[PDB]
Design a protein around this ligand. Structure first.
Ligand SMILES: [Cl-]
Lengths: 80, 177
C-alpha cells in the first residue's frame, strides 16, 4: 500500500466528515474537500489538537506527509 | 462490565491494559501502541472511555505512541488519580463515540482560597486550557490546570449532555463555586 492519510473532521455541530487521501496529496486537496461540504477557507479554520495547530495556516502546496498529517488524524472545523 | 467481573468461560479481553507513565503530560491524553490501537479498532484522536478501580471512569483522547508496549497504556497523574490507579495496575479501554459537543459544563475550584490569590480564573486558567483543545470531560473529574504562576485544580460538577461531553467553542462554561 502507498501511504494514505485518513482524516476525520468534526463539523461545527460536532458530527463528522471522513475521507482518505493519498499522503502525497497537496494539503490544498483537503481544503477543497471541506469547502465542497460547505466550509469555505475564508469562513472556517481547520484545527488539529495534538499538538494544537491551525492546519489552514499551513502551506497548501505541501503534501500531507510533509505537514505531518499521516496516517491518521482527527481535525476540527471552527468558524473564523 | 466491571474490571472486577468475569465469567469462567470467556473470550479474552484485548482491552485490559497496564498503566504506565505518560510522556505526554496532558490531562486529556492516553497513549497506546499502534498495533494495540489497530487491534481495538481505535483511530488517532478518538474519544475513549477508561474504567478504573471503585467504578471510577474517565474519558480521554487516544494517541499512538511508538515507545509504548502493546499491553500498556500511558497516562498522566491526573488521569491515574481520577481512576484511582497506580502504575502497573489494570484498566479497561473502550471506544466512546457517544461523546457530543457539550451545551454547558459546571466546574469549580476545589481550593476555596485560590480565586482570592490569583488572576481571573476563566482568563488565566480555563479559557487557555479548553480553547481550541476539544477536550472530553466527565462529571466528577478533578483536573489540574497550569496557568499563571501556580496550578489550580477544578472539579467537574455537571455536564450537559450528562455525564460527559467535549468542551467546544460554544460550550457554556459555568464556574461557581
Ligand atoms: Cl451548570
Amino acid at each position: 500500500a502507498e501511504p494514505v492519510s485518513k482524516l476525520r473532521i468534526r463539523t461545527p455541530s460536532g458530527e463528522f466528515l471522513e475521507r482518505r487521501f493519498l499522503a502525497s496529496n497537496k494539503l490544498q486537496i483537503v481544503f477543497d474537500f471541506v469547502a465542497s461540504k460547505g466550509f469555505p477557507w475564508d469562513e472556517y479554520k481547520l484545527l488539529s489538537t495534538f499538538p494544537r495547530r491551525d492546519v489552514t495556516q499551513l502551506d497548501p502546496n505541501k503534501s500531507l506527509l510533509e505537514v505531518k498529517l499521516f496516517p491518521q488524524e482527527t481535525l476540527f472545523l471552527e468558524a473564523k | 462490565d466491571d474490571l472486577s467481573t468475569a465469567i469462567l468461560k470467556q473470550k479474552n479481553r484485548p482491552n485490559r491494559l497496564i498503566v504506565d507513565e505518560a510522556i505526554n503530560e496532558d490531562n486529556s491524553v492516553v497513549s497506546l501502541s499502534q498495533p494495540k490501537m489497530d487491534e481495538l479498532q481505535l483511530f488517532r484522536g478518538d474519544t475513549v472511555l477508561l474504567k478504573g478501580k471503585k467504578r471510577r471512569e474517565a474519558v480521554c483522547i487516544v494517541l499512538s505512541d511508538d515507545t509504548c508496549s502493546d499491553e500498556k497504556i500511558r497516562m498522566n497523574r491526573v488521569v491515574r488519580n481520577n481512576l484511582r490507579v497506580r502504575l502497573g495496575d489494570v484498566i479497561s479501554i473502550q471506544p466512546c463515540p457517544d461523546v457530543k459537543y457539550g451545551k454547558r459544563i459546571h466546574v469549580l475550584p476545589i481550593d476555596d482560597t485560590v480565586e482570592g490569590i490569583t488572576g481571573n480564573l476563566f482568563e488565566v486558567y480555563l479559557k487557555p486550557y479548553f480553547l481550541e483543545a476539544y477536550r472530553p470531560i466527565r462529571k466528577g473529574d478533578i483536573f489540574l490546570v497550569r496557568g499563571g504562576m501556580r496550578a489550580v485544580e477544578f472539579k467537574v460538577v455537571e455536564t450537559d449532555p450528562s455525564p460527559y461531553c467535549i468542551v467546544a467553542p460554544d460550550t457554556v462554561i459555568h464556574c461557581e463555586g
